[PDB]
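BUG-1172 | component: ligand-complex export | severity: low

The export step for fe (iii) ion jobs runs without errors, but we want the raw record kept on the ticket for reference. Input record follows.
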Amino acid sequence: MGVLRIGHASLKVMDMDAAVRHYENVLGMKTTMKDKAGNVYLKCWDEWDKYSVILTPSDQAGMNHLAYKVEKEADLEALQQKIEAWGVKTTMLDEGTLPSTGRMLQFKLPSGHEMRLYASKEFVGTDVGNINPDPWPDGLKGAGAHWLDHCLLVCEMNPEAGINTVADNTRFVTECLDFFLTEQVLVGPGGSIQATTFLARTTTPHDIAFVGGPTSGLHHIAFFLDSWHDVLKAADVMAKNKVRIDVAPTRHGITRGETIYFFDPSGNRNETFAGLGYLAQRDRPVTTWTEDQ
Amino acid sequence: MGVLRIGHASLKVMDMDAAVRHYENVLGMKTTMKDKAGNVYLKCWDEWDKYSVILTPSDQAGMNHLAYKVEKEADLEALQQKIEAWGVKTTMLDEGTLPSTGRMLQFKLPSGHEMRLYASKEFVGTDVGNINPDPWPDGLKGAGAHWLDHCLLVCEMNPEAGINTVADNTRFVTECLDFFLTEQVLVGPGGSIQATTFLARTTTPHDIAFVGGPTSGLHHIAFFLDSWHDVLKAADVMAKNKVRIDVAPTRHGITRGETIYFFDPSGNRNETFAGLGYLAQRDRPVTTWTEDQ
Amino acid sequence: MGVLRIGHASLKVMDMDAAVRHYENVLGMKTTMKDKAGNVYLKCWDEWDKYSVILTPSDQAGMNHLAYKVEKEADLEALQQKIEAWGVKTTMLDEGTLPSTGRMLQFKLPSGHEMRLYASKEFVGTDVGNINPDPWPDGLKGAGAHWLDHCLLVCEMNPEAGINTVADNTRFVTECLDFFLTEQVLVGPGGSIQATTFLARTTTPHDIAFVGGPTSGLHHIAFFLDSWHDVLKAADVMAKNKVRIDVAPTRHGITRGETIYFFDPSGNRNETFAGLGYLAQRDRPVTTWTEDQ
Amino acid sequence: MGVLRIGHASLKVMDMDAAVRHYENVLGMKTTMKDKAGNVYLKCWDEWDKYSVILTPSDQAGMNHLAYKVEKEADLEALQQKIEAWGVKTTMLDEGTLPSTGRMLQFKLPSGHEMRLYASKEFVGTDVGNINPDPWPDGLKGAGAHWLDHCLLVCEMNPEAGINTVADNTRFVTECLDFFLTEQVLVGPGGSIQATTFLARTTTPHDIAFVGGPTSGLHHIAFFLDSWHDVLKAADVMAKNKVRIDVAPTRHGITRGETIYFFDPSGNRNETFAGLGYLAQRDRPVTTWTEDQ
Ligand SMILES: [Ca+2]
Ligand SMILES: [Ca+2]
Ligand SMILES: [Ca+2]
Ligand SMILES: [Ca+2]
Ligand SMILES: [Fe+3]
Ligand SMILES: [Fe+3]
Ligand SMILES: [Fe+3]
Ligand SMILES: [Fe+3]
């Protein structure tokens, strides 16, 4: 029972035309629907649900909410009961609040971000199928992102004021959503302050992550690639589409994943990383990174 | 709760000297202990428990048993209760039956293979550590296998006699051990016969697998590699060590993984495969392969 | 002065429709012209001349001739003079004998194969251009072969009858065409018989190659790929197009290149190999392979 | 006849201990001799001559001279005659001026750099051999650089003062040493000024290169790696050895090669790049890069 994986992220964009072509031409996503409010829904080729990204028209960048898929409908009532006993108010959005999406349990993380849990989303299948499928589809565009892999949230952190929502988010998703901690970055005196945490429900190194910051916001959303080669191909695609790159291709010590950071036309940061890195396991020791490194 | 991943495989070897150097020089494992009965225990560099492979002296090849690690000790009593309600007799080996290994729940699969579940094995840590670790260790030998990934068992199957232990094993590990089916190979009229099944507890495509055969036995044990390049490097290592190769480097339609099949000096088949392939998910449709392919 | 590289190979095909779609869909070549005799001319994307492959309709497979490009027109008279002093009759085909192709010096190798040298072929440029070009073109099909790299000829060899055209071809192309030997396979007593030779004009390991055989013929023509990954992608393409594979993906000890062998619909063998392997140099010792290996 | 490839580069280092361990541990070179003046000579594993790098103790960084190997001894007299007819004074250092090195033709490029040509250097062979060799050697250290590939020189350039030694060097090595231009970077009005040139004798994209600068000096020396993966491995090695990186792993539009720039302990810049990129050919159009890009 419980959370399976990240379900979708809803992003604020200023230019919908430029944002849609970015996630299509650079990341290889396909648009699956547009609602009557102007929001655009896209999915990756190796995903089988209706969408993993929502672009909403806005006057600014940022994130609206973050959604995670749970195993079955009855998990929503159980998780809801755990969350409110912890002290977080929840509410249940009924099915149809978002198109092609079932009912959703809505609540705010301690850091202030809105998080949703759903059990039901429309099945459309992957672009390769499931009866004698090919390993990859033809006509793939751009980097050919497999799936939306995880999301790193900037969480308000003021050690002098006694505020560390990275720690509070980390406790919340572990005790209420049964995530387990895989890696952490420790700062402060003797590493007594959690500045970055990576947590998992799958056996990939992280499905959610929190990094400290002056205010709560969105650091980036990330997309999975197969190999070190596909990262290089992704860098070539970004060069052809004139994409503003943040960090050049380099292996992250975290996740052991080789990654590229770049932006969409509205300023939201995106990551294409390759490789599993390691098998995340509930009995695996937490990889600790110290501030001096 | 429940099974985490494959824990170890115990293999019968005829020449212990030749078998130990094979798993050390070809696969990159390290020997961690030898018991007073002559059995040798080895682990991979990216594993943190004491051992994942047991070599036992014998007059023949084959497998002794297969072991899977569970989340906590109390899971053994719960799984034991489910297994016997299904109709499989179990027994509890106490801690110390194997060195550095806690108590084990022992039972036979419908196909006749002996399977064990343990919760506790001695921690020794990975070869890269967990405080600011490197992505890979220096002095790595051979293919540098990350971890024992899965095991494919040959399961007795006689469709005319009404015997299909691939199906019975598949039902057993799903209903009793809460595995979920990720891929299958269907044969017979209209694909009405399961000849091969792949099942998972992690989010890797398969942690156990069953293939039909005239008699029940061991098809191969498999080891994980990072990338397509490490497979090539593995093929070069096998050429330097004069290893009997079964299948040349080629991508498997199953798992989407690029793999090599080869043998140890006693005849047991080994696999080095690279890549996650896809994220196995309980809501993902089962990849079906038909006999005509 | 002298030979630059392999220029084109003319192959006999039985089904022109099936052969053209093979070299287009599998190897990624593009058809550039068809003459009034039904012959089809194709080039690779990273080539700048008009064509590197000629498909001629025929009732059998095999090779018509092999063509190499020389640095300047005046090299043809000089090479012609060296060849006839060696004892090989030559003839000069005038410009236009083949469409878009200048005059050609024609002669037969000692093994009996027809070889041609030209200095002038129509320029059409590569598919990426030469003013701020991209590293690779979009819409690339199949394996995306960079260029026709080399050709391995089966050369009549009968050691008991005193016939070894592999040796005679090797002496001919070295003394007359200033090729240099990079690798060889030695067989017979103490390696006193050259069974396979690889020779170069470029600094790639081989631009022509000869292997012994009962009769003189065509072993394969080969196409260059960038990396180990592109070989895997090539294997996936051949699986999608139902291509008859000869040898699975494996690294060749020769050339150090990772390669795949496969056939076109008429039976001619093709090779897609990746990597430079090493820098061929006139002062580099000849890599010798012995029969026992 | 003529130049084969870059032969060696002589660098000034301030800390010989720190410099030698850098080229050994990071680049994988091996020290082959030390002369009585304190100079240290190193070679790469896939080279067969005595050394490709000379470290000389000094109070500053920079380059002493650059050396290229020619095909035969008699080429030195012929090249010497061409060079002085062009207007460059030459001198002949006799054999033994450098240990294990034959006689050398010495002269200064128009940019002021000292260049040497030799025909004879002591043979020691590659680390894999030449009788049934392995594709790569065991116990390889660091990035495992195959060979010193090329050298980029900063050449004094003052367009207002009428000084452009990039152009003068480019004319010199083409007309006197029979190099051919493969790529160029054009700046100024309408691209009427050569700011960077790449030239070849091999069929690799460049064996020497010149970039404009206020003063003449050394930009970097470069080492060849096989694949995109070996570049990643190189970045991991530099991280383990605490190497000052200049440019993160990224594909260069020039050469199409994926590269890393970094420094030795004395400040000299080094490059590890992978891949052939394209086959350099005397009939290939010069790849032109414009200033706006
Ligand atoms: Ca993940
Ligand atoms: Ca697995
Ligand atoms: Ca070649
Ligand atoms: Ca070069
Ligand atoms: Fe990330
Ligand atoms: Fe397997
Ligand atoms: Fe070949
Ligand atoms: Fe360079």
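Assignee comment: Attached the raw record above. Chain A touches chain C at residues 134-136, 138, 227, 229, 236, 239-240 (CB under 8 Å).
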